[PDB]
Design a protein around this nucleic acid. Structure first.
Lengths: 563, 553
RNA sequence: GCGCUCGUAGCUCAAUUGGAUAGAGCAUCAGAAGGUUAGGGGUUCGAAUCCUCUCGAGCGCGC
RNA sequence: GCGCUCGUAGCUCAAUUGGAUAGAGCAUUCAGAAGGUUAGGGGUUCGAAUCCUCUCGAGCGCGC
């Protein structure tokens, strides 16, 4: 149920009937304060200028043809001409009911698109670092959200499985095999190819045979790759990320394309051998002219083939990119090249969602106390430990068999539900005291809140198959608030899918919880004057439980049934 | 079924028919080779010397009266005079059959008693170092084994909750300026005078509030230790904590009544008892400084006196063997704890890495037990997600937990100084927890695919006609003997070796002696029944060790 | 030197993309307090949001 | 200086506590083979890795 889009039309299909142009835009948002009802129409003022009249007069000129009967119970004008809509109880207590009768809670299925999500993107022959945790989590949240809506999501893991370093890598592997897993690999082999070593010409030659390709050096490649991706699939499985091995499309598939991509870029008149390198000129920035590359004898030419392959072979209607902030240039530049070359059209967006670096409670890069890179596994280990200590001092002397299970949900959930709360792209603070707490917008609070709600719909007799025969009658203004927000689940979902931002979902869920936690300490679902309301508020509570569950599911957050 | 004890009496009260005296020992053990039958009787020789005559005449001089028909089917003599008993393929089948009918697999419940087990024993204000892992695992294994036998086991966690160290401790907890009152994050000891010091003169007496501030950082330590126990799957609780604090107000009268018996004498400046093994035994320094021995002695008394002990097992370090037998000689030459209640001391050395170097980190620090369990879990994850990758996530933490921590336990449970090596423990080859865990898996498989319902499988014969069947069936029944040795000697390593031997016997019995659809129904169910007992035996056996058992791998 | 992303309560984060009196959670003396949205100027009915400067933080291409 | 625990196949560990030809697992995918003066001498007895004694070497406890 997308009430916004509903009122969006009935106001648009109005307005016109009060003198308005075709390209018309009502601005139907959710009211800030509760003074302004459940929804606002802001589109007046802006329109009330292109015709040069008066906003507070164009206002009720629309209400004359605006018939929100059976929908709203109170429509009034306020301020410089806002149209405030106070939803009618009987309208809410009809879609609150419709959501219950559906396994998708009334959420409608959009036009079945085909989207490609680019997330995680770890490196080869290196233990996965914590600087990739953000990309992996948010990307998976996007995928889950899109998948629930019904689209066809192609998970894309752009693994750095190619580069110069493989000469330094494979040679070490070839040598490290003469003694007998990856922990001091990339680190030790680096100590050779600089100071000090003699047969690095062995390594610098070992790479030039990989581009040519013969199974021997091809095995030493895949062998080195498959081990890294096996270590990482473990990390994913621990992290509850939906990624898989057959979701890997790294810097290998987008490599034999490099010739006939700049050649075709030259065979279309767009490249000049400036400075000594193939370059392609664009025009939308500074006081002279900037310039990307392609060759010289790069991290911009690969993405072009990438963004092309998504469209031409994978039939991507849309393609999301969850990548570090320090890559916005290299993408936008290399994407503007695809916009003025016609590889991928216009109906196919190339979205880029960004984020900064991991920092601690001190503005410095997130590192260990030794002063170095933090392994993601080592982070998850402490997450589970700190969670155990958390659950212990509140629920001690309890079956260990169901503590690790609960500590898993709390700890691993907190690690995820911490990027799913921030939307910035200018670095971020990692603080255990913020994420692992029963207070605030934290996963444990949501997880506890969900158990709380669920308990109410448990201690009562009223079985499952006759409860939904007694209807919902909303008579009080806290039930109306709750029921409204409950129905705004589709809106939030559509915003997440559109903007690629899961923080909205979490903000909603946090906001959704607070309503219940206020609807509870005032409106006794427990026991009231009659059965008519007892069952009604149960269903009203029953919905949020299903809603909180489904919401947390789209984020990839475990939900324990009991705390 | 303790077949050993059976033949041990069926021979002693049969060696009597040879003039052999009362104080007699038939000394019958399990055979060394399969060609020496299932059991040997060794007690001939020494008795033949005792009464002058020749052994291999005294040998069959006994067989004349030895009536073992039914119980045996082939008693013969070899060597200098060994009586070699070969069990009868009907005596075994009868007991293999009845072992199934019990939930204890026939293991008789012995003379019910009250045993106290002293294990683990960590310190407060300190994250549990790895040096206490050995004591914890083995001790718990003993507790589980004894408890299965029906005894009343008292878990005793001798926590170092007392000492001079609480000076720098409490006078640093009062330095709680992070936030308000409360503590969760440890690492206090490595963190940090006359500003303190006098704090301990307040507490050591009968303090009012410093003891209230003492009964909390002990609580905060033993709270995280319970987490580690929970992770390790150890039956220890907080209720089982009986630290040095208990054995401290007892120290006056103990050193006092040790004077009102004429055993201790003031020497050098101290208070010293003399023993027969000489330097004296200091039980109070010149400064009134009590020792470990002074706490070790009050401890042994409290066990018998208030706890009604019949036996007290001490699973602690080997570095304290001197400081323990001495105090245990003082309890026995002063009439505190009697003679019928043993004070056993099971021991183990320091913990080393695969190079004889004391078990340190990669930087040379003392490994924290929590960090060890984390690595065990991780290396288990890699181990499992390789045999069968692309497999879920739940059945990957469920396994890696069992495989990981089980390997950690089933590695101290097979030794008695030692070397920790991930290569030796986390492998499906050899006497390791994974192999045992996978061995249990494969056994249950042959019991799974079958069509015969368990409830009707009961009323079915167990005919035994082949030597491999007899080999297995005999070994199965020897479950009680193994338990009896573990409970007695306090060594869980025997239970492992048996379990490892048993698992290997089934494997040989498997790909050799068909169960999966054979010549006739009379055989199929019989071997399925043989396969059912070993499954239960391996399960029940691994349970006494404290080893998790998954159902599929 | 050019160029990217930014600057919001003491801290960690919001603000439905230009809407009404900038909101939550810790912290500080259930409600309370906490703000010239780094700062000036400008664009219009209306700005934390957009345009131009200054200062400042983080990171990419530069001789 | 006295005293404690020990020394087994190239590594990690067994040997029913005084019993028969000292046994497995790694190492040199399943089968097989090979691997030893039980640190070493002496002694106790029908019989010793086990017990007694000295020597050598490892670890750790109170010395002085």
């Amino acid at each position: 149920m997308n009430i916004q889009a509903l009122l969006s039309e009935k106001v648009r299909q109005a307005m016109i009937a009060a003198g308005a142009p075709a390209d018309c835009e009502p601005q139907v948002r959710q009211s800030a304060k509760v003074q302004f009802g459940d929804y606002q129409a802001n589109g007046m003022m802006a329109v009330a200028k292109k015709l040069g009249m008066a906003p507070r007069q164009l206002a009720e000129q629309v209400l004359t043809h605006l018939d929100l009967n059976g929908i709203a119970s109170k429509v009034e004008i306020a301020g410089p001409g806002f149209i405030n809509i106070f939803l009618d109880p009987a309208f809410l207590a009809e879609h609150v009911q419709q959501a219950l009768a559906s396994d998708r809670l009334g959420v409608a299925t959009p036009e079945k698109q085909t989207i490609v999500v680019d997330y995680s993107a770890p490196n080869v022959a290196k233990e996965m670092h914590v600087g990739h945790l953000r990309s992996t989590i948010i990307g998976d949240a996007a995928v889950r959200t899109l998948e629930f809506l019904g689209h066809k999501v192609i998970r894309a893991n752009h693994v750095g499985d190619w580069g110069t370093q493989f000469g330094m890598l494979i040679a070490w592997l070839e040598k490290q095999q003469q003694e007998n897993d990856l922990e001091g690999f990339y680190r030790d082999a680096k100590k050779h190819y600089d100071e000090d070593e003699e047969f690095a010409e062995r390594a610098r030659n070992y790479v030039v045979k990989l581009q040519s390709g013969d199974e021997y050096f091809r095995e030493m490649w895949r062998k080195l790759v498959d081990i890294t991706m096996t270590q990482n699939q473990i990390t994913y499985d621990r992290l509850n990320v939906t990624l898989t091995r057959d979701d890997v499309m790294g810097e290998s598939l987008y490599n034999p394309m490099l010739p006939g991509i700049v050649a075709d870029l030259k065979a279309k008149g767009l490249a000049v051998e400036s400075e000594g390198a193939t370059v392609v000129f664009l025009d939308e920035f500074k006081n002279k002219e900037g310039e990307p590359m392609g060759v010289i004898i790069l991290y911009t030419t690969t993405d072009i083939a990438c963004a092309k392959y998504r469209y031409e072979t994978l039939h991507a209607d849309r393609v999301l990119y969850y990548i570090d902030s320090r890559q916005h240039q290299h993408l936008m530049q290399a994407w503007a090249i695809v916009r003025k070359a016609g590889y991928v059209p216009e109906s196919v967006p190339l979205e880029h969602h960004m984020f900064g670096m991991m920092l601690g409670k001190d503005g410095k890069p997130f590192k260990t106390r030794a002063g170095g890179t933090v392994k993601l596994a080592d982070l998850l280990d402490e997450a589970l430990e700190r969670a155990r200590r958390l659950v212990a001092e509140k629920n001690p002397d309890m079956p260990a068999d169901e503590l690790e299970k609960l500590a898993n949900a709390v700890g691993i959930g907190a690690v995820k539900y911490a990027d799913l709360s921030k939307n910035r792209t200018t670095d971020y603070i990692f603080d255990w005291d913020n994420m692992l707490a029963f207070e605030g917008n934290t996963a444990p609070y949501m997880q506890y809140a969900y158990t709380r709600v669920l308990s109410v719909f448990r201690k009562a007799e009223i079985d499952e198959e006759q409860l939904a025969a007694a209807p919902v009658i909303i008579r009080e203004d806290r039930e109306a608030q709750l029921a409204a927000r409950l129905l705004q689940f589709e809106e939030t979902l559509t915003v997440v899918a559109r903007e690629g931002t899961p923080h909205v979902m979490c903000a909603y869920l946090y906001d959704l919880a607070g309503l219940f936690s206020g609807f509870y300490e005032h409106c006794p679902i427990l026991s009231a004057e009659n059965e008519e309301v007892r069952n009604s508020r149960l269903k009203l509570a029953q919905l949020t439980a299903k809603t909180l569950k489904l919401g947390l599911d789209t984020l990839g957050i475990e939900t324990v049934e009991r705390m």
